[PDB]
Structures are given as C-alpha cells and as structure tokens.
C-alpha cells in the first residue's frame, strides 16, 4: 500500500471526508479518490462535504487533484497544452477562409451515398440513422460492441425498437448492415475496406466531461484518426465529424497574438481555453481532420449544441440522468429559485431529430464547406424553460442574488449536485458573440428551418421526463 499518514490538521480533515464518504477503514493522504472506489458522482458528494466544511472547491478540482495530499494544497495556497501549440495552423486557416456563403451557394452539392456510421448505439447516432432510413436511398453500416447481446446485430436491433415507434428491422440485412467493431481498434476498420462506402459520419464519442483517466482522448482522438485513416484508403470517402460548439470556448487567453478574433464556421484555434479534456479531445479531432483535408481529404466539422429530445414525442436518451443542462434545471426546480443571471442564460434547444436531419444535409453540402454550426438557432432563456415546469406546480421562482445564496446555502445536500456536477461555484457570479448564422442560412437554402422550442415542444419534454419522477 502507498499509505501515508496525514501531516497537518487539513489532511487530516480531508482524509477523514475521503473515508468516510467512501466507507473505507483507512484512507492515506496519497490515497487518489478514484483509484480506491471513488465514483465521478461520489466526487459530487465529496465538494459538497467540503464545501459543508466552508471550503471553496469546484468539482474540477477533485479531478485535477486526486488524492488529500493535493487537495490540501490547493485548498491552503501551494502535455495537452504543448500539444495544442507545436503546431502550424497556416494550412488548416487558409482551408477554413474557402467555407463561406459564397462556396456553398456557387459550389456543387455532394452524394451522400453509402454511409459509414460510427456511435449508432448513442443518442445522436440512433437518430442519425432513423432518418436515413426514412430519407436517405442508400445503405447505412453502423460499426458497434456486441456489450451484453450475442451478436451487434441483436443489440442494434434492440437500441431501434427502444427508440422507434416503428419497426425497421426487416431492413437489416438489406439496408442496414450491422458490423462488429470499435472505432478505436484500427484493425476493425480492415473488414470494410472491401465494401462501397461514400461517407463516414463520426458520432461515437464519449460526452463525459469529467473524468479521471484519458480513454476519452483513445475514443474521441484516436477514434478519429483511426477513421480518417479508414477514409484515406480511398479516394472518395468524405469523413464527418461530429464535433462541438463548444471547441469555440472562451475568448482568447492571448488577445495580443489573436486581434479582432471572430467566433465563426471559419474558427478553429485562437489560444482560448482548452483546459478541460472534453473540449480538448473534440478539438484536436476537429485539428486532425482539417489536416487530413489539407491532404485531400473531403471532410466536414459539424458541430453541434445543447441535444436535447425529439420534436415529435419528446424522447430524450436511454441515460435521460446524465445530461449536464437537464442536471442544473433539475437543481434549480429542487431549490424552487434560481437568481438572474441563471434566470438570463440562453441556450440552444437541438431537437434530436431535427440535429440528426441537419447532419444529414450538411453533409451534401460542396467540398469548400467544411464546417458548420448545427444548432437550434431560437434560443430560449430559462425564464422561457422555468415558465413551463411551473405549469406542473412546481412553483419556481426568479429571485435576487443575495436570496439565491441564502437557498443555496440552505441546500448544501443532494439537492444541488445537478448545479455542483456543472463545475458551479456561487462565486462564479462570451458565449453571446458565437456566430451561426451563415449555417442557418446554408441550411435555408437547403430547405431546413429550426422548430421553436415553444412551451408545447417543452411540455413534450417535460411530460417524457416526468414518466420517470426525474425531478422527484
């Protein structure tokens, strides 16, 4: 064992929280949380004992410092990133210069035509291959794990009938091809190298945006390279990525070096903030498959934002608990209050459905347009999402900061792990000045409009949570 004594009171004191939280008889001050039975939501548990103790910690801290001994001394005062910066983006930004409104319209569209897809078994992924089944005319292979199933043909086939009203399993076999595979093993890419492929559409990804090892860089960076390497094998496989909004993260931590920074389809690297390993891993994806494209690669970035459930019924995921937006609402109609800036907060509603619809469409766009910003451009505000849980009684109410503060700290249980899994700090009291508009319009043109978010389309939402007493 690397047991090692606590030395001063506060190791003492975070050692003792440690242990008792995790229910184990001895804890060392070098002991890391998550290698001794510590969980990504026990860590949730673990800020908010701390901050029951008047500690000012953030759920990346326990992250970022595994063991008490580290804790310790960030709470008293005491090679992505390398990565990131050793590398020219003269290429890359010449590329993005050519996607403009121009391109698309004077350019010819592409054929979709056989579709790769990747991550069929996930929330984007299922949708994704809905609709090209109900709007596409070719075939569609979709690389999954058996996991528990006898074979990835039956665990596909159950993922459909969970989410569909309908019945598509008299296609497999005809216009659904299940094959066995993981995106990061390159050697499964082998079997298809033999089969008519025209595009591959990248949604596999792991969305945790917390974690305590690096998988998520072997799913969501190696993966894709793994795939565009698939891709270069030929001279005409376009490669999609599914990617995400937020690789725009911050404004610049360098504004010297990067004058006049815009926030568009024609952004990828301006020095802003990549610390957390979700955003970074999307990003290098996003860097890795630009590259590819300054090789002659076809490609598409088609970032995406809040997704959220479908238009028509209302379904969201299988693990309707783990989403990060739904968490902090959750949060807020357990305190029954949230204060004005939290009242203020936009955020994009991406239909599931309409998402998946929106992919595929962009991706027929001409060669020149590479990257897109797929989201619901109709914002609403929380005052819009609060308006339609309280027609459920609920009874939430806008209130000052001083007021938030005095719930908040009324409410130091498992009440507030929604706002706390978030990375929130009551001290923490940009994203405005990210544009999409060129997407909406190239997508206009393609005969897509965004559907409200309307207090219909939420109550269809909420109405689905509530089948599972999610806010009870």
């Known amino acids: 064992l690397n047991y090692v004594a606590p030395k001063t009171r506060l190791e003492h004191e975070i050692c003792a929280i440690f242990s008792s ?11 890391n949380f998550f290698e001794i039975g510590g969980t990504s939501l026990i860590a949730s548990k673990l800020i908010i004992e701390l901050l029951k103790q008047g500690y000012s910690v953030r759920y990346d801290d326990i992250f970022r410092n595994k063991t008490p001994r580290a804790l310790a001394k960030l709470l008293s005062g005491e090679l992505t990133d390398d990565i990131i910066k050793n590398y020219n983006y003269g290429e890359i930004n010449e590329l993005l210069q050519e996607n403009t409104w121009e391109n698309f319209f004077d350019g010819e569209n592409l ?14 992924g299922i949708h994704i291959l809905y609709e090209f089944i109900k709007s596409e005319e070719g075939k569609i292979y979709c690389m999954l794990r058996k996991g528990k199933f006898d074979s990835c043909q039956e665990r596909l086939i159950d993922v459909m009938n969970d989410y569909f009203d309908e019945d598509f399993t008299d296609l497999v076999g005809s216009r659904i091809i299940p094959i066995e595979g993981d995106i990061t093993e390159i050697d499964d890419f082998k079997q298809l190298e033999d089969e008519p492929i025209d595009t591959v559409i990248n949604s596999a990804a792991l969305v945790k945006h917390y974690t305590a090892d690096d998988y998520i860089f072997r ?55 990549l610390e957390n390993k979700y955003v970074c891993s999307k990003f290098l994806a996003e860097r890795a498959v630009l590259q590819a494209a300054t090789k002659g690669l076809p490609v598409k970035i088609i970032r995406v934002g809040n997704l959220m459930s ?16 739904l968490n902090n609402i959750k949060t807020i109609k357990k305190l ?33 347009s590479r990257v897109f910003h797929c989201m619901n451009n109709h914002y609403i ?14 009874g939430i109410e806008e209130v000052d900061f001083e007021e938030f503060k005095q719930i908040y ?13 978030a990375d929130f700090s009551i001290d923490d009291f940009f994203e405005e000045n ?35 007493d999610y806010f009870e």
Request: charged share 25%; glycine share 6%.
């Open 434 to 468: 990210v544009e999409i508009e060129q997407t909406v319009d190239i997508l206009h043109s393609l005969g897509f409009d965004w559907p409200e978010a309307d207090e219909e389309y939420l109550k269809r939402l909420f109405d689905y949570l509530n089948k599972f």
């Open 336 to 368: 029954g209050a949230m204060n004005p800036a939290m009242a203020s907060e936009k955020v994009d509603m991406s239909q599931i459905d309409y998402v998946a619809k929106g992919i595929l469409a962009l991706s027929k766009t001409p060669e020149k």
């Open 219 to 273: 799913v969501n960076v190696d993966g894709v390279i793994n795939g565009l390497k698939f891709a270069q094998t030929r001279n005409n496989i376009k490669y999609v990525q599914i990617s995400t909004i937020s690789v725009l993260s911050s404004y610049s931590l360098n504004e010297e070096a990067y004058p006049n920074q815009e926030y568009d389809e024609r952004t990828l690297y301006y020095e802003q903030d």
């Open 409 to 421: 700290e009324q409410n130091m249980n498992e009440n507030i792990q929604g706002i706390i899994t």
């Open 381 to 394: 505000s929380h005052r819009d999402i609060v308006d339609a849980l309280n027609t459920y009684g609920y």
């Open 310 to 325: 479908r238009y028509s019924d209302g379904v969201f995921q299988k693990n309707y608990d783990t989403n990060a937006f």
């Open 21 to 31: 939280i995790l229910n184990i008889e001895t804890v060392g001050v070098e002991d």
């Open 111 to 124: 054929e979709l035509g056989n579709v790769l897809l990747t991550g069929a078994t996930g929330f984007l």
